[PDB]
Amino acid sequence: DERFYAEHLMPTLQGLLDPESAHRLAVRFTSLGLLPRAFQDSDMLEVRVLGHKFRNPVGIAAGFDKHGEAVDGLYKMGFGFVEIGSVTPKPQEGNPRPRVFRLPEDQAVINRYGFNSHGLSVVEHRLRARQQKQAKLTEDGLPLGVNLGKNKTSVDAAEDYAEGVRVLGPLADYLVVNVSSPNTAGLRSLQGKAELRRLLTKVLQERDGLRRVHRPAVLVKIAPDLTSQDKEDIASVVKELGIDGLIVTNTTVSRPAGLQGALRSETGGLSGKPLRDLSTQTIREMYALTQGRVPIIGVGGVSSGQDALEKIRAGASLVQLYTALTFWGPPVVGKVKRELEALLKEQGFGGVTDAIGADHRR
Numbered sequence: 001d002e003r004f005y006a007e008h009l010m011p012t013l014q015g016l017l018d019p020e021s022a023h024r025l026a027v028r029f030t031s032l033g034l035l036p037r038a039f040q041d042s043d044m045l046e047v048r049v050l051g052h053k054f055r056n057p058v059g060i061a062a063g064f065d066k067h068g069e070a071v072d073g074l075y076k077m078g079f080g081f082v083e084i085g086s087v088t089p090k091p092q093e094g095n096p097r098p099r100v101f102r103l104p105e106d107q108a109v110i111n112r113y114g115f116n117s118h119g120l121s122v123v124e125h126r127l128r129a130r131q132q133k134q135a136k137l138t139e140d141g142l143p144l145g146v147n148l149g150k151n152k153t154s155v156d157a158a159e160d161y162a163e164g165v166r167v168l169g170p171l172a173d174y175l176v177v178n179v180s181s182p183n184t185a186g187l188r189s190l191q192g193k194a195e196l197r198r199l200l201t202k203v204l205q206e207r208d209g210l211r212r213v214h215r216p217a218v219l220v221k222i223a224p225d226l227t228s229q230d231k232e233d234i235a236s237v238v239k240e241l242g243i244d245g246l247i248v249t250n251t252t253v254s255r256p257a258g259l260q261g262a263l264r265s266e267t268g269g270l271s272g273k274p275l276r277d278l279s280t281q282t283i284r285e286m287y288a289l290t291q292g293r294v295p296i297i298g299v300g301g302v303s304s305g306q307d308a309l310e311k312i313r314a315g316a317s318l319v320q321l322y323t324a325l326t327f328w329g330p331p332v333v334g335k336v337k338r339e340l341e342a343l344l345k346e347q348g349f350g351g352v353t354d355a356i357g358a359d360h361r362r
């Protein structure tokens with residue numbers, strides 16, 4: 001029940017556990033399938049993109065399952081697709097705790113995990129243990145994405161991503177080159193035109209070298225804090241290299257006027273409601289700059305069917321959410337899907353596909 005989780009369970013749980021502990025428990029419970037029984041996906045929610053079928057367009061954003069420990073439990077939660085990561089080549093602990101903060105009054109979160117990761121090797125074996133099961137899930141419209149990061153002390157960023165492509169690329173439907181984390185020094189500078197072109201050329205060559213059935217689509221995840229110039233350059237490089245898609249957006253280092261949370265000034269990436277429209281507008285811009293020819297996964301502040309549809313109409317073929325789950329719990333997934341379907345009908349769309357980029361055509 002949506003009300004029970006939102007009004008009693010989640011609030012109570014958050015009053016007993018600090019945010020990081022709550023997240024750990026969340027991963028455990030999800031991996032064990034301890035979830036409230038979930039909404040029947042209708043044909044209207046089906047979407048075909050990135051060379052795959054997605055039974056519904058709502059996925060779990062990177063960061064919740066960083067090490068690929070609860071993939072099956074997440075599909076059970078109702079997500080149309082799952083994205084794990086970010087995963088770094090070698091294992092690393094990330095930043096010291098506390099590194100995640102709740103801003104209840106803003107329905108937001110600020111985190112500075114710093115790419116805490118079990119590493120490629122561990123995640124590789126974890127995914128291989130269910131590789132064939134995933135193959136059937138994917139064929140049944142439930143794709144898997146793998147988000148790649150880089151180690152804090154890496155001297156060659158491009159090689160870190162290349163290694164991720166070689167090790168986890170064969171186990172993913174799509175790979176995400178995450179160059180938008182605000183918690184790794186100098187990482188976002190990789191979004192620059194020159195560095196991005198060099199980086200992505202290497203990533204794509206590595207990807208193309210994989211055997212056909214193990215060749216994933218490659219997407220780039222960008223920040224919501226890019227200048228107009230940065231966006232023009234990214235769009236240019238994407239079209240030049242044939243990048244398969246974009247994930248828009250990661251968390252923001254900005255602090256919108258109006259934040260009420262006592263922890264609003266903590267260093268880190270802000271997620272949730274305060275990021276919603278900044279992300280939607282970034283999706284709108286990237287869609288236009290790419291002439292609607294580059295698939296976009298919209299992410300940032302999605303907690304309702306309306307939030308999802310606004311991003312879809314802005315140009316997103318798929319959407320993801322994370323923060324909303326931390327406030328409303330598992331039931332939010334079914335809620336978003338139910339509201340989205342109803343809105344699609346009310347607005348005269350035959351299905352999700354018909355609504356993609358609709359705002360640009362009116």
Ligand SMILES: O=C(O)C1=C(C(=O)Nc2c(F)c(F)c(-c3cccc(OC(F)(F)F)c3)c(F)c2F)C=CC1
Binds near residue numbers: 014022026109326327
């Ligand atoms: O809650 C938090 O403060 C934060 C996070 C979080 O993962 N929160 C969740 C949580 F604490 C849970 F218990 C969740 C779950 C996960 C699965 C089942 C659940 O129902 C229960 F507890 F009754 F079993 C609740 C969940 F999905 C979260 F996102 C991530 C950053 C901060």
Ligand SMILES: Cc1cc2nc3c(=O)[nH]c(=O)nc-3n(C[C@H](O)[C@H](O)[C@H](O)COP(=O)(O)O)c2cc1C
Binds near residue numbers: 111250
């Ligand atoms: C606690 C936390 C950890 C995250 N970790 C990652 C990560 O490792 N890689 C990544 O690409 N994004 C990461 N993100 C960002 C989310 O994938 C997403 O882009 C962003 O939070 C906006 O969506 P939301 O408002 O629904 O949370 C993280 C977000 C949070 C809140």
Ligand SMILES: O=C(O)c1cc(=O)[nH]c(=O)[nH]1
Binds near residue numbers: 178
């Ligand atoms: O691990 C992290 O701190 C992190 C990575 C990322 O891409 N985004 C985010 O908000 N946090």
